[PDB]
C-alpha cells in the first residue's frame, strides 16, 4: 500500500531550541507531514468521511508547533506523529520532517533538521 495524504512546507514561527537566545528570539520552523492511508474507499465513495481531513491535520501540527517551546526538533516531531497516530486509526504510519532553515549555525546552507517515521499501533 503506497497511498499517502500529505502536507508540505508548513511554516510556523516558534521558540523551540536548546539555546536560550533561540527561545528568546524564535524562528521559522518548516514542517512536512506524510500519512500512509489507504485511499481506495474514498476514491470510490467520494465521501470525505472515508479519509483523513488534511485541514484537521494542519490544526494538530499547528497546535504543537505554535505552543510551548521545547528543546529538540525530535521532541516536536514525536509529539506530532503521536498526536496524529492517536486520533486517526486510518493512518497506518506518520512521517514528520522538521527543518530549521535558519539555525544559530554560522555558515551557508539551505537548512538542518530531522525526520521521523512512526507506525500507528
Amino acid at each position: 500500500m503506497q497511498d499517502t495524504i500529505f502536507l508540505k512546507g508548513m511554516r510556523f514561527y516558534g521558540y523551540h531550541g536548546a539555546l536560550s537566545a533561540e527561545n528568546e528570539i524564535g524562528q521559522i520552523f518548516k514542517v512536512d507531514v506524510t500519512l500512509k492511508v489507504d485511499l481506495s474507499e474514498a476514491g470510490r465513495t467520494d465521501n470525505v468521511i472515508d479519509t483523513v481531513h488534511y485541514g484537521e491535520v494542519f490544526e494538530e501540527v499547528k497546535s504543537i508547533m505554535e505552543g510551548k517551546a521545547v528543546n529538540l526538533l525530535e521532541h516536536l516531531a514525536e509529539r506530532i506523529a503521536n498526536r496524529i497516530n492517536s486520533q486517526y486509526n486510518r493512518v497506518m504510519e506518520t512521517k514528520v520532517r522538521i527543518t530549521k532553515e535558519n539555525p544559530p549555525i554560522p555558515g551557508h546552507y539551505d537548512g538542518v533538521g530531522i525526520e521521523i517515521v512512526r507506525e500507528n499501533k
Copy 2:
C-alpha cells in the same frame, strides 16, 4: 523494471472540493502522473506505436480534471488512474499525485494533497 513515462506539474483550474464555496470559486489543481511502462522496445525501434503517447495521457487527465466537480481529490485520482490503466495495457501501474496548493486552510504551507498508486489488472 524501473522504466517510467511521466507528466509533471499539470495544472488545471477546477471546482472540486467538499466545501460549497470551493465549488463556487474553484482553484488550481496540480497533477503529477507516473506510469510504469517497459520502454525497451520503443528504445530499440524508435516507433511511437511501441510506447504510450504522453499527449493522449494529458488529454485523459485534463478531461477528468476540467470536468464535473467532485468532493475529494481521492476520487479524482481514482478516476484518472482507472482511466489510464483501462486504455493502456502497456501501463503496468499508474501513480497519481494531486495537490491543492491553495486550499481553504488558514495558514502558511506549500500545499496539501494525496497520491495514489494503482497497478493495472
Copy 3:
C-alpha cells in the same frame, strides 16, 4: 533622496474580497512595503532611535491585514499607507503593494493586485 526601508513578501491569511465566498474561505495576501526615509543620521549614529523600526511597521501592516475583512485591496493598502505615514514623521512617502496570488479567477497567472504610493503630509 533615494534611501529606503523595506518589508518584502509579507504574507497574511485574510478574508477580504468583493465576493461572499472569498470572505468565507479567505486566502493569502502578499504585501510589499517601501518607505522613503533619509537614513544618513542612523547611518552615522548607529542609534535605532534615528530611524524607523521595521518590526513596528510589520505589526502595523499585520493588524490591518489580519483584521476586519474589506472589499478591495485598494482599501487595505490605503489604510496601511495612512497608518504608517501617520505614526512616522521620518517616512516621507509610503509605497504599498498587495497581491492576490490566488484570486477566484479561472486561469494561469502568478498573481494580481495593486500598488499605491502615498506621500506623507
Copy 4:
C-alpha cells in the same frame, strides 16, 4: 500619480508566430499587464465600482491571446493595450509585456519578447 493595477505571469497556449511550424505546434505565451489607475477613490470608498476589475482585464487579454493566430507579439500587445484602454476610461495608460520563453531559437536563454506602453487617449 504612481498607482497601478497589475496582472502578472498570465500564461496562454497560443499559435502566434511568423513561422508556419509555430502556428502549427503553438506554444505558451507569458503576459504581464500593468495599468496606471488612480486608486484613491476606491481606497477611500472600498466600492469595487470605483476601480478596474482585474478579472475583466484577464478576460480581455485571454480572448486576444487565445484567439486568432497572428505573426507578431507586437500585434498581440497592441490589440490588448488598445482593448483595455478602449473599455476603461480610468486606465490612464497600459503596459503590456509578452514573452516567448520557448521560441524556435536554438540556444539557452530565459526568454525573448516585447513590452509596449500605451497612454489612453
Copy 5:
C-alpha cells in the same frame, strides 16, 4: 552498494520528436544521468583513474543529444545508457531521464518525459 556519480539538468537544443514540425523547429531537451559506481577505491586513493570522469560522460550524452534527430525520447535514452555502459566497466547500471519541458502539447505543465534504468552486462 548505493554509490553514484551524477549529471543533472543537462540541456541540449535538439530536433528529435515524432512530429515533422518538431524536427523542423527543435527544442530544449533536459537530461539527468545517474551511474551506479562503487566509489570506495577512488575515495581511498584520490586517483581520478579509479572512478568515472563526469566530463567524459557529458561528452557522450552531448554527442547523442546534439546529433541525428530521432523520433522518441526512449530511443535517445537507450542510446546513451548503452553508450555509457559500453565504455565503462565500472558503471554497474545507468539511469537516464529525458524531459521535454516544452512539447507541442496545448496546456500548462512543468514537463513530460521518460526515464530508463539499464544494468551493465
Copy 6:
C-alpha cells in the same frame, strides 16, 4: 517612447577573463539584452519586416560571446552593443548586461557583472 525588445538570461560558455586560469577553464556568461525600438508600426501591420528579429539579435550576441576570449566584460558588452546598434537603425539604444555568476572570487554571492547602455548614433 518606452517600447522595448528583449532577450533575457542568454547563457554562453566562454573563456573571457583577466586571469590565465579563467581563459583556460572558461565559464558560463549570462547575458540580458534590451533594445529601445518603437514597436507601433509592427503593432499595426503585424509584418515582421517592421521590427527587429529577436533571432538575429541572439545570433549577434552569440558570435561575440562564443568567440575570441577577451579580458573584460566591459569589452564584450561594448562589442555587442556596437554590433547591434550598427546593423539596426530601428534600435534607438542598446542595453547590455553581462553577469559572471561564478567568478574566481572566494565567497557566497549570486553574481557579479556590468551593464552598459548605448544610444545608437
Copy 7:
C-alpha cells in the same frame, strides 16, 4: 550615464543587530552593491586598469560585514558606501542594499532591510 558594476546577493554571517540575542546568535546578511561607473574606456581598451575590480569590492564589503558587530543595517551600508567611494574615484555613486531575510520578527515575509545611495564627492 547609466553604466554600472554590480555585486548581487553577497551573503555574510554576521552578528549585527540592536538586540543582545542577535549579537549572540548572529545571522545571514544579504548584500547588493551597485556602482555607477563610466565603462566606456574599459569597453574600448579591455584593460582591467580602466575599471573597478569587482573582486576588490567584494573584499571591502566582506571586511565590513564580517567584522565588528554594530546595531543598525544603516550603519553597515554607510560604512561600505563610504569605503568604496573613498578608495575609487571612478565610482561616481554607490548603492548599498542590506537585507535581513531572517530577523527576530515573528511572521512570514521574504525579508526586511534598507538600501542607501551615496554619491562620491
Copy 8:
C-alpha cells in the same frame, strides 16, 4: 529504522579538483549530509545529549571542505563520512552528497557530483 538527521545545501568555497587551474581558482562545493540515527529517545526525553548535534556535524564537514585541496570529490566525501561515523556511535550510517555546480565542463547543466553511503562499523 527510517529516522534521519540532515544538513542540506552546505556550501563551501574550496580548491579541490584534478585540474591545476581548479586548485588555483577554486569554486563552490555544495554538500548534503544525511545521518541514520534512531531519534526516539531524544523524541522522548527532549535532552540534546540523546541525539547528534547538527552544529558539530557542520563543523566537521566544514573543516574537511575548507581545508587541504584534494583531487576527487570521492575523497572528500570519504573523509567526511569517515569523520562523522568515527566520532558518533549513534550514527548508524552516513550519506554524503557533493556537487560541483560549476565544474570546468563546457556546457549547460545544473551540476555534477557524487554521493556515497557508508555504514558505521
